[PDB]
Subunit: 261 residues, 4 copies
Amino acid sequence: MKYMITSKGDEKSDLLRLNMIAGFGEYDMEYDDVEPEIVISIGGDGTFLSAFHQYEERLDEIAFIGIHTGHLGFYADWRPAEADKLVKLLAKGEYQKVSYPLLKTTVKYGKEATYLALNESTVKSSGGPFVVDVVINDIHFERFRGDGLCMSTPSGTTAYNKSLGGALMHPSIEAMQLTEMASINNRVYRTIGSPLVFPKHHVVSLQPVNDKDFQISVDHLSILHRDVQEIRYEVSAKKIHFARFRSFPFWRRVHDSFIED
Amino acid sequence: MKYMITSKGDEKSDLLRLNMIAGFGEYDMEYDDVEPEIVISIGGDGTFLSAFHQYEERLDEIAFIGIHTGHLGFYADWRPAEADKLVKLLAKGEYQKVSYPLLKTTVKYGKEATYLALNESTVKSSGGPFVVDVVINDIHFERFRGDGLCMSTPSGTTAYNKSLGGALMHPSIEAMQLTEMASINNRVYRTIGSPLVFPKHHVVSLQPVNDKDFQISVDHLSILHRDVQEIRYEVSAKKIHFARFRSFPFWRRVHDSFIED
Amino acid sequence: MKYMITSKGDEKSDLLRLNMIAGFGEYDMEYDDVEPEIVISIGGDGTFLSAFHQYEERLDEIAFIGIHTGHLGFYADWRPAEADKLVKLLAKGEYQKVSYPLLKTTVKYGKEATYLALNESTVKSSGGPFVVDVVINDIHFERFRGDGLCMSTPSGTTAYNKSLGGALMHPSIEAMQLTEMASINNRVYRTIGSPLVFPKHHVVSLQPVNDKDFQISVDHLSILHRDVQEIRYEVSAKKIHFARFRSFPFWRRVHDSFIED
Amino acid sequence: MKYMITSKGDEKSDLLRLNMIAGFGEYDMEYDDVEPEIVISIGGDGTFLSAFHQYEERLDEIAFIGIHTGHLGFYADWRPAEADKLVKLLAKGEYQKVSYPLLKTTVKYGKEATYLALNESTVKSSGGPFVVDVVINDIHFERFRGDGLCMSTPSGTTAYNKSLGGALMHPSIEAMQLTEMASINNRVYRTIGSPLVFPKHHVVSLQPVNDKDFQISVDHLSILHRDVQEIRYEVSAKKIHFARFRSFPFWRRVHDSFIED
Ligand SMILES: Nc1ncnc2c1nc(Br)n2CCCO
Ligand SMILES: Nc1ncnc2c1nc(Br)n2CCCO
Ligand SMILES: Nc1ncnc2c1nc(Br)n2CCCO
Ligand SMILES: Nc1ncnc2c1nc(Br)n2CCCO
């Protein structure tokens, strides 16, 4: 199969990348970073996030796999000592694939710019206060005033969603979770406070009230947007595909990362 | 059809119950509280919870409907002025049914006692400290020490789950949410802190460490259990059925109850 | 001086108690558990709490000191290997004393029963719902409905107050902190949600609305009270006195207990 | 006395300002915005914050007073219909003064720049991650990694400190409260999580780990700082002075703003 490997850039990751390429050279495996079928990430969850966005236009023809040269990540969950055993079963094929949901973010101006997220997508104000009207399925739900909002994916709930008080949900659930960022709640402003979990086909629409400039982020990339008319969130129809060679439950990766390993 | 109506017990609810019975008398409707097909609850969410547990052995042959003589409830979401219009379409049939998930709670001693919950099921200690080992799908996940735990249904997240910091999830999602109750987190005890959302077929098992007596509750009923060997939580295969005559979205019932009506 | 020593009851604590008594026998020290001037606690924070309530009627003539035979406590913060060096400077005197504030709890029926707390004092409902009217300095502030309330001392903020979301305050601040326990907040019930810190001479008064029976606790002891007309909280005029032989800052005991030791 | 009046800038505030000036003209009152002894703020809490920073170099010779032409503020807590009665007792003098604590913020580069805050002072990262080492009284306490930190004044706890989960403390307590902003807590990063209340003479020092650029704010003004070597927080020796003509308790201003008015 066509494969490619990215690296964090340091010695420990670059040396292991060259060893796996040499190990792949002993098989019927061709290196290609244009149309690969197996994308291997060596480094951390941040390195895996870059590998996802490098090939987000070919998500259906790619099976991702991550290797953590540091601590255990949620996407890079393979120890470096298992790289030689990974090269074997990747060439023999017959492996199973797991699919996680994704978040679609549509921005509208006065055209349309869409994005795909693996972790979350946040919205902040550039300088002035952040005040938006939250509309759920064409129905006005609340007028949020605070630092911002965060719409997270199922597998992304263990990251920024978790630090904001959100709940951890199993990645087999096709849903998205919205959490607040330091909301103001007096007798004049009223937010729900609790995190909200939306199923598929539900559309959450953010609409400005005064300022039209917002600092929007998708995973790692963050870019200022000007004259925003609407921000739409919804579960994406596309999914990310992983390659599994052993049982590593999500709740066990949660235990090893937050309880003890 | 066979129908029956329960009441909160006060004048406002008893008078409306007698008016609907007289209104049902003008149709091909028979009153029967033994094997009814339409169970009407007049009062509040607590009155609706009693109507659910009165007929939990016939959930598949019953379509529930609630009327709130006080403030708007999440289960009793029909104004009293709409009772006459309810009697009409209930006799003509051809109405649609909505189904919400349920929570199954199994308790084991040294036999087995099972329960069905519409809102949540909590576990506390009777007197001494509450220390249990949390096991998710046969894998030990954490040793919880605190006041207790709360496993909630999707439609039950707006109640006790919400007061504990849990997230609100749409009742169309077949899942269950576990939240903590004043957990201790020092350098010796370590809990996850975040609420956890489990999909179908996931089993969360609570196991004692020292004391074996627990104060377990299912919705409104709460009874002391002695010599408990295990407590098992999982999404139930049975569901509760409602009768809909108009579009009342869950997110709009959340708005009218917590934002403003 | 007159001294006495309590023990957790196990070997490790009983053996160290007998060694310190023999070490005290080599000095001008008399053992007396009736009117002691130095109360030594060997065990943990729970053992120290028992030593405090055994002699709460003589707080002004006693300097407490705690030894932890297990993990580091906030009151028992002396390693067992320092017991021999403790016996020396306790006989030579000339040591400094530190004073921490206390919480006074007054209960009224239809007489008066007062209590003194070192950590916190909580109020719960016995069976039915818990609904009380919170009155701050004769002014009605809110109608709380939930599991209960917790009024904590400065040094007690690191315990049950911390698990409820309360803030940690330095024990040199003469104040008390009130936190909530799973409060209900809809469009009909409205609580402040945030913890409240009251200075000296402020009186927080809890008054029943329906049920008059409450499950009140003071530190470790918890007893049911019937026909309660009012519950009054205020910072006590009495303080607890410790014996210091080295600088152990409160913020360093917080670090070693929750960050890492 | 020498006095001056600021306005929000709209009709309702400008008209009331001209009426009070004409009302002051009937007395022995001189208008002067250079060295005033009575600073009157008409508008809201934001307008009052501007009046404080306009004359922060003369805090000991000024008694502030605020008028809210909109909703009730915590600093502007006088209804417009009471302006005529304010002009009377302000000229007759013999009024009492109330004093609230302040927060001192010192920034060091590679000189020193100091600031005075009435509400709070926050620190964020400009672009990259925010990682600082928190040092309390020359002792390392934790390595914070997240969005940022917020050090609040007693009277400022009802604002941004409240939205971050902090506690509300009476302004008669000379202290400062530090809260977190979406902290990361895994098996490698460990923060206290709970808010911290520091008494007078305690110094909290923030020190960079990688990036040296921070987005620091003091009340409303926010300015980027480059090559920061340290950030020091401590309770200020200076206080702000108000003019009281009636009893308006802090806990009652909390009730009217968050419960109901
Ligand atoms: N999905 C994720 N779950 C947990 N952690 C994550 C995730 N993605 C990244 Br990048 N990280 C690391 C954040 C800095 O510790
Ligand atoms: N599922 C529910 N969601 C919200 N509220 C509820 C629910 N069930 C009951 Br009973 N209540 C009323 C609790 C006391 O206000
Ligand atoms: N004041 C206290 N601060 C922290 N912890 C405490 C305190 N008192 C006791 Br008892 N503990 C132990 C509780 C069970 O871990
Ligand atoms: N000290 C303060 N307490 C409460 N609220 C405040 C304060 N200062 C200002 Br400005 N506000 C208004 C913030 C936007 O509602």
